[PDB]
């Protein structure tokens, strides 16, 4: 009951959703839309199994991209410190079998990889653009189908990988070439570009009032948040127990907001997309469920779909 009075004090608050994105990664100055994404990643969508035996992904995948200098890895430091069932790994150190699973001998057996060791939690991947593409493709089943399946020597197998991915990346050339849409800054192709639910570009654009604020934070961080890590961890474990329901006004609004994303991504005489697939429709479902989990409400309003839709526009629009 000593703890229940704190959850009661939290869920009653007029502005709790603001207090949550301000309590995430408190050692990192600014980047408030990334704080918001990381909160939603730790809440997740509702996992669903269809009457046809087809499984649907509930977990959210976030990609952070930016300059090689601009704080991205301090999120990965934070998340692997905060979130249960989590691992750190990175691109140059990577391999296909290091990420997923390897086969070991001397009879053969499974050696668990980074995406299995983080099953029901977050796999944090650093240096992601520097990962060899032959090792990058190994996660395409584990990102979407949430299982790793294997056929080698005498050991065929199928393994769980119900893991959220948080990936940190550098542009090809270091500097985010602001002249380009995200689809051109980064060595990723449509198969994996469409797997991540949303992308954040983050930058250190040199300006003196920002520079003086940031330097002031980094010196005060040397021994100079509205919630504690112990409070925020208990709030999340509470929020994760809701399974939000899509109301009829939200169901009908969601179809029009997906049409408005999908109409604009079209290119060439064929009207082919590149970023918008139905994985981004299911991403609005996953995000509006996590947005509802943070509010501790069992039912989705269309305003939570608007908040999800702006979190998708914030990845797409760069000209």
């Amino acid at each position: 009951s000593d703890e229940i009075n704190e959850l009661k004090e939290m869920v009653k608050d007029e502005h709790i959703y603001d207090k949550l994105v301000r309590s995430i990664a408190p050692a990192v100055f600014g980047h408030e839309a990334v704080k918001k994404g990381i909160l939603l990643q730790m809440l997740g969508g509702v996992h669903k199994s269809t009457v046809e035996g087809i499984k649907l992904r509930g977990d959210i995948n976030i990609c952070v991209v930016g300059d090689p200098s601009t704080s991205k890895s301090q999120f990965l430091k934070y998340v692997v410190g905060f979130a249960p069932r989590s691992v750190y790994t990175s691109g140059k150190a990577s391999s296909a079998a290091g990420l997923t699973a390897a086969v070991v001998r001397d009879d053969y057996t499974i050696e668990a990889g980074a995406l299995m060791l983080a099953d029901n939690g977050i796999c944090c991947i650093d240096e992601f653009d520097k990962m060899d593409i032959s090792d990058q493709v190994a996660i395409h089943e584990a990102m979407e189908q949430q299982t790793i399946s294997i056929a080698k020597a005498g050991i065929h197998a199928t393994l769980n990988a119900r893991t959220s991915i948080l990936a940190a990346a550098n542009p090809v050339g270091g500097r985010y070439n602001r002249k380009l849409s995200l689809r051109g800054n980064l060595n990723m192709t449509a198969p994996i570009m469409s797997r991540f639910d949303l992308f954040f570009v983050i930058l250190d654009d040199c300006n003196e009032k920002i520079d003086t604020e940031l330097a002031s934070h980094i010196v005060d961080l040397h021994m100079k948040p509205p919630f504690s890590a112990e409070q925020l961890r208990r709030y999340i474990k509470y929020a994760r127990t809701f399974k939000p329901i899509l109301t009829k006004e939200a169901r009908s609004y969601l179809v029009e907001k997906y049409k408005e994303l999908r109409k604009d991504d079209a290119q060439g005489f064929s009207r082919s997309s590149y970023r918008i697939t139905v994985r981004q429709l299911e991403s609005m479902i996953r995000l509006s469920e996590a947005i509802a989990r943070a509010n501790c409400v069992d039912e989705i309003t269309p305003s939570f779909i608007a908040e999800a839709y702006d979190l998708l526009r914030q990845s797409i629009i760069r000209v």
Binding site: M116, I150, A151, R251, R262, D265, R271, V278
Partner: protein
């Protein structure tokens, strides 16, 4: 004896799988093949033996399951409606129901609409999946010559288009099936390999995915992303439906009568409709000709097909939500209600109808 080990999807990750010795007696022998997920009922027993008591240094007894029945954990498994040791067996009142529906005018188009009933559109893929899932007829001519009866299918296309969900549905629906993926599948994890025992320490065969799916289906997700050295192991099992090993003084031929369903993406990750097929894909004529249905999926934008698709996907999330006359029977009237909104035919009936039509 059968050494039975924990199932890798229930074994917590990074912790070792446990095993037990199981004993099969008269009429239970030869019931299960190495590598199946099996469910045993039996008597848990123990006996003295000195080797335990010697090496462990305590009065400790070895334990054995004397098996009294065996079931093979096929189907969807998160399902209360599927009793008995064989989920693909039918009763007489079920065979009579197959005969009734088989003479429905338009039964083919009902069955095709029931392939992955929660995936919208793609009726050409559902058609190709239905044909591969029932198969043709295998033929032998005066004993001299033979023709392949299995139908192979290539799902080639753009991202986020249910190529992988169609394959994961066929793994639930087919009688014997095996699933494999890209860099996770080797030349001899498909096919077959030779093992050396640590004790008797001479050579034996271990069967790969195309043996463990024999009279069944092998599902190859991200087929374009296999190594060419691994991908070219399939060429014998596509047409000759065999695996001819000659390794370590073992020289022999296994049978491998699978249908193979494969899913791939084009070069650059997207289909480019102005190019010929041989330029959209990194494959070549000997493997492209072994596939005998090709499905091309283009994810083009359209303001009304994307309303119909988005409506179906939104309704499919609400219907599949985990919070949407005794309880063990009463759950089946709601499972039947939800399933029959989507599908012309019950999925439990279609699984048994397919196995019946194949056998």
């Amino acid at each position: 004896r059968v050494t039975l080990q924990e199932a890798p999807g229930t074994v917590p990750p990074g912790r070792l799988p446990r095993h037990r010795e199981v004993i099969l007696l008269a009429d239970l022998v030869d019931v299960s093949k190495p590598g199946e997920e099996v469910e045993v009922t039996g008597i848990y027993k123990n006996n003295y033996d000195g080797n335990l008591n010697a090496k462990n240094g305590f009065p400790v007894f070895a334990t054995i399951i004397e098996a009294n029945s065996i079931k093979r954990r096929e189907g969807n498994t998160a399902n209360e409606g599927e009793e008995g040791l064989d989920v693909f067996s039918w009763t007489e009142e079920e065979e009579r129901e197959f005969r009734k529906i088989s003479r429905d005018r338009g039964i083919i188009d009902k069955i095709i609409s029931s392939m992955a009933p929660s995936i919208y559109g793609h009726r050409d893929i559902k058609t190709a999946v239905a044909c591969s899932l029932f198969g043709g007829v295998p033929k032998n001519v005066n004993g001299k010559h033979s023709i392949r009866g299995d139908i192979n299918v290539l799902l080639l296309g753009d991202p986020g288009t249910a190529k992988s969900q169609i394959l994961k549905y066929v793994e639930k629906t087919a009688h014997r099936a095996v699933f494999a993926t890209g860099q996770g599948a080797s030349a001899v994890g498909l096919t077959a390999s030779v093992r050396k025992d640590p004790i008797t320490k001479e050579w034996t065969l271990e069967g790969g995915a195309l043996v463990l799916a024999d009279k069944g289906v092998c599902l190859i997700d991200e087929f374009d992303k296999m190594n060419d050295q691994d991908r070219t192991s399939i060429h014998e099992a596509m047409e000759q439906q065999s695996i001819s090993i000659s390794k370590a003084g073992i020289v022999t031929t296994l049978q491998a009568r699978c249908s193979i369903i494969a899913a791939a993406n084009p070069n650059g990750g997207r289909y480019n409709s102005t190019l010929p097929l041989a330029q959209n894909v990194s494959l070549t004529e000997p493997i492209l000709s072994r596939f005998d249905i090709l499905c091309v999926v283009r994810d083009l934008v359209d303001e009304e097909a994307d309303e119909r698709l988005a409506t179906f996907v939104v309704d499919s999330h609400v219907r599949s939500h985990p919070e949407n006359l005794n309880a063990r029977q009463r759950r089946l009237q709601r499972q039947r209600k939800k399933e029959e909104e989507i599908s012309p035919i019950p999925q439990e009936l279609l699984m048994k109808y397919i196995h019946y039509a194949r056998t």
